[PDB]
C-alpha cells in the first residue's frame, strides 16, 4: 500500500550523514521534490529502522513532516517530505539565528506544540523531541520529525538532557514526558541552538534535576516564558500542561500573557 518502485525517484544531492545511513534531497516521478532516508545495510536490524514509517503511516498532520513512500526491498528508503531549512537546531545555530526574535521563534514553539497536540490527541509519545528533530521549511514553518522512537500509549538509551528524569530514571515514558522535552526545546529556541544545562554533563544533569534544580531565565527571555518552561519541568508528571494549553498559551502568547513585549538585542 505505501510500496513505491525505486525506479520512480532519483537521489540528487546529498544533505546529512552518519553511521546511521544517508538523507538525500531527491526527485520523485519526476516531479515531486522529496527527501530521502537511506539505511547503510547492516548497521541496524531492517525494520527497527523501518518502524519510523509505520508510525508516520498511523500519523499525519500539517506540522508533521509526512511520510511519502517506502521501498522495502534493499536498498531500503523512506520517502519524505522535503524541509528546505532542515533542522531547526542547525537554523538557530547558524547565520539564519542571528536575526530572530522572540516573535518569530515563539510562533515556531507555538507550530511544534501543534504539531505535538495531534500527538497527543492520539496517544502517541514521541520519545526524542528537541531542536534537532524539529525540520524547517520555508516561512519559518517548523515541522515535528523523527518518529523512531515513538510509539502508542496502550529502546534502549536516552539523552538524560532533554528526557523527563521519570523516563530516563523508570522508562515512564508518557505524554508527560514530552512536555518536559518541550520546556527544553523552549530553552534551545531562546539560547538560539545551546545546548541545556551549560558546563554540566549527563551524571550532574541527573542527580541535580532529582535535587530540584532547573535551568534559570535565559538572557532577555520573559519570565513568563521561564514561567511555562517550568511549569513543563514539574516535578510531577500529571502537574505539567497538555499542548493543547502549550499551543493555546503559545499562540496568544503578545496579547494575553506579554502585551507589553518590546524588542532587545537577541530577543
Ligand atoms: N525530510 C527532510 N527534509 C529536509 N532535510 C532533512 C530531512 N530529513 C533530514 N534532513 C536533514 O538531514 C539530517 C539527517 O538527520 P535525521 O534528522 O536523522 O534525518 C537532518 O539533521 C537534516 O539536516
Redesign the pocket.
Known sequence: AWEIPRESLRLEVK????C?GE?W?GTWNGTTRV?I?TLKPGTMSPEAFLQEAQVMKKLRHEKL?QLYAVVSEEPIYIV?????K??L??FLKGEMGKYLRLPQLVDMAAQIASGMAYVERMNYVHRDLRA??I?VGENLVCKV??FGLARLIEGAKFPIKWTAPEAALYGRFTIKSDVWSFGILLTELTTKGRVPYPGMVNREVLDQVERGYRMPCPPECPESLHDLMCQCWRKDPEERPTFEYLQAFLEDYFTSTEPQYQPGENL
Open positions: 544533505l546529512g550523514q552518519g546511521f538523507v534531497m527527501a532516508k513532516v519524505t517530505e522535503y524541509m528546505s532542515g533542522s537546531l542547525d534537532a528533530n525540520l520529525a523523527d
